[PDB]
Amino acid sequence: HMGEFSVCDSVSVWVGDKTTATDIKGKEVTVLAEVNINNSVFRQYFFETKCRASNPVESGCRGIDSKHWNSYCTTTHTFVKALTTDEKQAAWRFIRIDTACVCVLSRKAT
Amino acid sequence: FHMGEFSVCDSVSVWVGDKTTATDIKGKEVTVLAEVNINNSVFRQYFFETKCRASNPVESGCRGIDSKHWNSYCTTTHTFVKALTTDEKQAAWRFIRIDTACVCVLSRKAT
Amino acid sequence: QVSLISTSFVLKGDATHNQAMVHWTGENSSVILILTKYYHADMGKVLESSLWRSSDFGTTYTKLTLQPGVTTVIDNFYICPAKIILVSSSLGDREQSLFLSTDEGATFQKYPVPFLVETLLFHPKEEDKVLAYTKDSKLYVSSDLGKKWTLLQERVTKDHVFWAVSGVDDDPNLVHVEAQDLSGGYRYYTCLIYNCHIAPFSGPIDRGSLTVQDEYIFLKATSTNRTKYYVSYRRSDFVLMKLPKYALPKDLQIISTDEQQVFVAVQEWNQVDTYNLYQSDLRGVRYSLVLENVRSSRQAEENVVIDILEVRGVKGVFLANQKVDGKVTTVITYNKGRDWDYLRPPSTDMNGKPTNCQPPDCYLHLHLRWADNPYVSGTVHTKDTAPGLIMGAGNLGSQLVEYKEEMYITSDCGHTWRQVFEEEHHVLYLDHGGVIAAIKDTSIPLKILKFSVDEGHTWSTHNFTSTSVFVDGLLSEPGDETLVMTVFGHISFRSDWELVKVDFRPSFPRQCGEDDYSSWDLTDLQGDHCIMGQQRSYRKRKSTSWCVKGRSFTSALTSRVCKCRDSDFLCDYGFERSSSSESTANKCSANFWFNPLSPPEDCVLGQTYTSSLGYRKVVSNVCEGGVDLQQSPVQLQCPLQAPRGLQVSIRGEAVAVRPREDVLFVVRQEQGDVLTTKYQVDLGDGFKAMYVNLTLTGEPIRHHYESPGIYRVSVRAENMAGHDE
Amino acid sequence: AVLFVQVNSPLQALYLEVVPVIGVNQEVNLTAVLLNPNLTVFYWWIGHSLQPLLSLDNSVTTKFTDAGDVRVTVQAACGNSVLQDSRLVRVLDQFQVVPLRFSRELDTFNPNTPEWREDVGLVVTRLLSKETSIPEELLVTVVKPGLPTIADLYVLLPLTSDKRLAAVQQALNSHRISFILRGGLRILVELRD
Ligand SMILES: *[C@@H]1O[C@H](CO)[C@@H](O[C@@H]2O[C@H](CO)[C@@H](O[C@@H]3O[C@H](CO)[C@@H](O)[C@H](O)[C@@H]3O)[C@H](O)[C@H]2NC(C)=O)[C@H](O)[C@H]1NC(C)=O
Ligand SMILES: *[C@@H]1O[C@H](CO)[C@@H](O)[C@H](O)[C@H]1NC(C)=O
Ligand SMILES: *[C@@H]1O[C@H](CO)[C@@H](O)[C@H](O)[C@H]1NC(C)=O
Ligand SMILES: *[C@@H]1O[C@H](CO)[C@@H](O)[C@H](O)[C@H]1NC(C)=O
């Protein structure tokens, strides 16, 4: 209705039940369920935030000057250092994690 | 590069090895360690920070806004990263706030 | 369906960030005060603040201003307890001042301070009396609301200063102090509002003075190889507390000196993980075992936390988390600690597929005071405001985990549990358990709000705001018989603060009548009504009624009595139970280190002690006595004491001695003082002297050695019982 | 210029560890338990003679040619504090020694506090006297400082001592001598082969 709208509808969730992910190089890696450091056992919690939909309205993003622009929403992307394994060696690798949902434009031809 | 011309807001990325201070999830300012020791391996805390370049890329806030019905402005969003920081007492793997993207905020006008 | 009002408000100041304090003023006042303060890290500790006041349920906040640059209100602004008076504190580099109000913060008058400040503390009932903890560790006081000041003590310890109880002890002007005496001494003083010195017993402590507002006072005496702990009941003489002689303590913490007795937790073996829960008598001396293992952490540097929750709704109901091996299980007791048992699972939800847990092999478990997981932002809580209402987050299985937290509730005090929510939820109670409001506790902002008027059986959702807000806290109007709720937090896109008033009174404007309730008899996990020897029955508001449970609540109206049973007695100090649960009954046998034949401490000739058989009635159990294992042995005797623990020492730290010097000798025993005790003394230089009742004097004897060298002092304590050297 | 310095200001407590009984001409392994590194000052007053022995080590080894009661005193002054503990021990000649096995479970609840050990030995002696009808002050039980709980029993005379030995043996083997340690925990004592 009113208040302050987000230009794209996002969906946030914490994931501790993380099993698989994609590393920085593009290879599908396996994220360990729990980590042991200094005899302290941690759970691999990751804060993921993706898009709810690529078409919040009929014309892509919400609140765009549609008469002169085409628009669409898309997910963001960041890296988090986590203890993973690639079926061979276990190491602290960087994995891809979503963070936000942003709108992107393209000039429309009248 | 199927994105398009540009994003609705001006974003800028950077890798930060120069991480000294931060703010945790609880809202307390903590001091970030320069390096981390796990077993006998020494790592460095690198952070991937993406923020805005400006809150008004154009006159009507965000780029490509139907300003006849909306008011808009760009602002930096964030996530939480588990990093080894310390306070005045003990060090721990705390979740600190890290900038990661730039988003646009809208508000309805009165016709 | 329902009827309520919700109103949001944003603190209009654009320069809003960092921290803030929100507090009501008195009961049924509709006036709220807020301090919006801006901290600074990196050892700066500097503050910049603004002040806000609302005089209408928190729907409209006015930014209170002062003529110069806005005063740097520092941390604690606090109200007068019970009688509405407000005090505000202000820091400078070296300068200080104060502000006082008598009309709910409408006219703040300025006053100076002739000293530094770290915190304050009012008198529980005296409106104009208040003391001040000064940053350089001092203690001042004022009986004129802080307009002028005088000095009491100069080396107090951090947060170990107390006022005497106003309802108990019949004297309300005392000031109990733990203060550093001389060099490296810590003592317990008691002064008055005007001036001071040491009425009760005083020895050495390493910052451990604790006085709970009930009848008890405590003391932590650090000693050479074994430490000691003392109690004082009804301001009596200090007595060493009876802990097992050989089940040694590392550290201990007072869990609950509430109601009739004392509950303490003592870490025996340094697993750095588990404590043992012991219970005393009315005097707080005879401690016996109650619970074996409990979780234990240390968030603050010197502050620990122990997983246990006492339900104030029913006197004698406890819940606790045990840690055995690696499993954290949840247990409950209605017998005030005699027998514990697990929580019954509901086996129902939105889809009550009975693949969930059954009694035999996995129960219900709750996270009491600990939130292991990171995504939850607020402190974890299981609340117990109303009688029979206990709502909290937990697991469902054989132990607790970090992964899954589900919000369960019980409306009959543990007998019937029911699952409500997924993920953790802040819970707020209104009208003595009339309305229960829930807000998802997490790091993501939200705009929703859950509330139920039928004790968690049917909830309703409400958009309490527009822009999504980070939920920082939930508060209620003082009294908790009201139906006004306050939510506060900082919104998502911008950092400015936001408060929300919620009013359920439009749906509950009528007072409950005596026919607006249905009956509910109190049982346990066994269906037995004789709890604490007393069958109890309470009232629950009718579902077909919209009324307020009232300023005064009617509970436990149907009260019947039972006769005593074996289940109404537990073991005494030093006796333990045999076999296992649901097998051998309460058989308390004396363990090995102590035997009930032994004489008590300080049986002077003439007195007659009563030996114990190892059982005692559950404290606060009101069962019909006369019969049923009263176990009054009528064993009257007392023997003459034998001399033991004879030790001779020199007064003070005269590590080196010079000839022809006032050398002071003192002799001490440990097994009483028989009024005919011989003390033979040889001082190594041929000085033969025999005395009587040296410990009765307590004062040293002088001697001067003539020749430089080494000597051997020999002391002999002799009676007709034995002999010691 | 040279200057030796040492830094051990606070001393808390000390305790002299020594068996209450041993025969003549037997080496005693006296121990001085104290709060400390190799920087330790120990004065040892073994008997009547004033002149104390100097030691940096916790333990000393001595003998006794005479019998009776011996005063053994130890004093510690590492820094500027003086601690001292004494102990009187019995040196006998007419006694028989019996080894004693305890149950393993007791080990998991066995602090080496000498008072705990004293009470355990006293309980064992009481039970022996109650199951053999022999004098109680002529039975001394010492349960050692080791991590495995092991006891030794001294049986005195003031022949018939063979029958007393046999009586204790029957009391331990034929009947298992039981001990109530913790609630639901029963220890048993028997012979240590
Ligand atoms: C003071 O009293 C404490 C008890 O409050 C005594 O502490 C205990 O002393 C024993 C004997 O030294 C310790 O056992 C030892 O353990 C080591 C391994 O660390 C082992 O190698 C030794 O053979 C011995 O068994 C015990 O850990 C220690 N602590 C406790 C809680 O029992 C102490 O002996 C007394 N000393 C003084 C000087 O007052
Ligand atoms: C209120 O919240 C509900 C549930 O989240 C949603 O269906 C509805 O659209 C919201 N209304 C507004 C005005 O935000
Ligand atoms: C004394 O005890 C120590 C420690 O076991 C041992 O090395 C030494 O041989 C013992 N000496 C005697 C005489 O028992
Ligand atoms: C202490 O010094 C003595 C020298 O007599 C030596 O035998 C012993 O091993 C030393 N102990 C340590 C712990 O250095």
GROMACS .gro file of C-alpha atoms in nm, chain C residues 223-226 245-248 269 289 292 576-579 589-595 647 653 655-656 709-712 714 725, chain D residues 12-14 45 47-48 50 52 71 80-82 84 88 108-111 113 115-116 118-120 123 126 179-184:
model
   64
  444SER     CA    1   4.041  -1.898   5.276
  445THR     CA    2   4.381  -2.061   5.243
  446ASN     CA    3   4.314  -2.405   5.089
  447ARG     CA    4   3.936  -2.446   5.147
  466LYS     CA    5   3.219  -3.225   5.346
  467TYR     CA    6   3.383  -3.399   5.050
  468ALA     CA    7   3.164  -3.319   4.751
  469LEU     CA    8   3.391  -3.017   4.711
  490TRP     CA    9   3.372  -3.120   3.944
  510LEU     CA   10   2.079  -3.280   4.694
  513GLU     CA   11   2.230  -3.348   3.962
  797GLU     CA   12   2.068  -4.008   4.982
  798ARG     CA   13   1.805  -4.211   4.797
  799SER     CA   14   1.827  -4.575   4.691
  800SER     CA   15   1.762  -4.752   4.358
  810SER     CA   16   2.036  -4.378   5.388
  811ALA     CA   17   2.322  -4.190   5.552
  812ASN     CA   18   2.628  -4.162   5.331
  813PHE     CA   19   2.972  -4.237   5.465
  814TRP     CA   20   3.142  -3.906   5.551
  815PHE     CA   21   2.898  -3.813   5.830
  816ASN     CA   22   2.687  -4.023   6.063
  868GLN     CA   23   4.693  -2.488   6.634
  874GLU     CA   24   5.279  -1.122   5.953
  876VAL     CA   25   5.787  -1.329   5.929
  877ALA     CA   26   6.112  -1.209   6.090
  930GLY     CA   27   6.824  -1.837   6.735
  931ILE     CA   28   6.557  -2.101   6.681
  932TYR     CA   29   6.301  -2.229   6.932
  933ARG     CA   30   6.015  -2.480   6.935
  935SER     CA   31   5.469  -2.674   7.221
  946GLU     CA   32   4.938  -3.120   7.071
  958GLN     CA   33   4.853  -1.984   4.992
  959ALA     CA   34   4.868  -2.315   5.179
  960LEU     CA   35   5.090  -2.616   5.244
  991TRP     CA   36   6.240  -3.072   6.114
  993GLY     CA   37   6.286  -3.520   6.487
  994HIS     CA   38   6.420  -3.384   6.814
  996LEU     CA   39   6.678  -2.846   6.600
  998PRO     CA   40   6.658  -2.834   5.991
 1017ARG     CA   41   5.704  -3.527   6.518
 1026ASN     CA   42   5.821  -1.328   5.223
 1027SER     CA   43   5.560  -1.560   5.378
 1028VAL     CA   44   5.605  -1.849   5.620
 1030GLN     CA   45   5.434  -2.461   5.845
 1034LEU     CA   46   5.295  -3.708   6.435
 1054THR     CA   47   3.586  -4.170   3.942
 1055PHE     CA   48   3.481  -3.994   4.266
 1056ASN     CA   49   3.818  -3.990   4.447
 1057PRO     CA   50   3.972  -3.652   4.530
 1059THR     CA   51   4.211  -3.455   4.981
 1061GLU     CA   52   4.066  -3.576   5.493
 1062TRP     CA   53   3.853  -3.766   5.242
 1064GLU     CA   54   4.112  -4.037   5.628
 1065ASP     CA   55   3.734  -4.079   5.646
 1066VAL     CA   56   3.744  -4.364   5.393
 1069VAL     CA   57   3.498  -4.639   5.751
 1072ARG     CA   58   3.490  -4.964   6.144
 1125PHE     CA   59   3.065  -4.981   5.146
 1126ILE     CA   60   2.797  -4.724   5.062
 1127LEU     CA   61   2.984  -4.454   4.870
 1128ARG     CA   62   2.719  -4.252   4.687
 1129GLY     CA   63   2.343  -4.293   4.674
 1130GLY     CA   64   2.298  -4.594   4.450
   0.00000   0.00000   0.00000
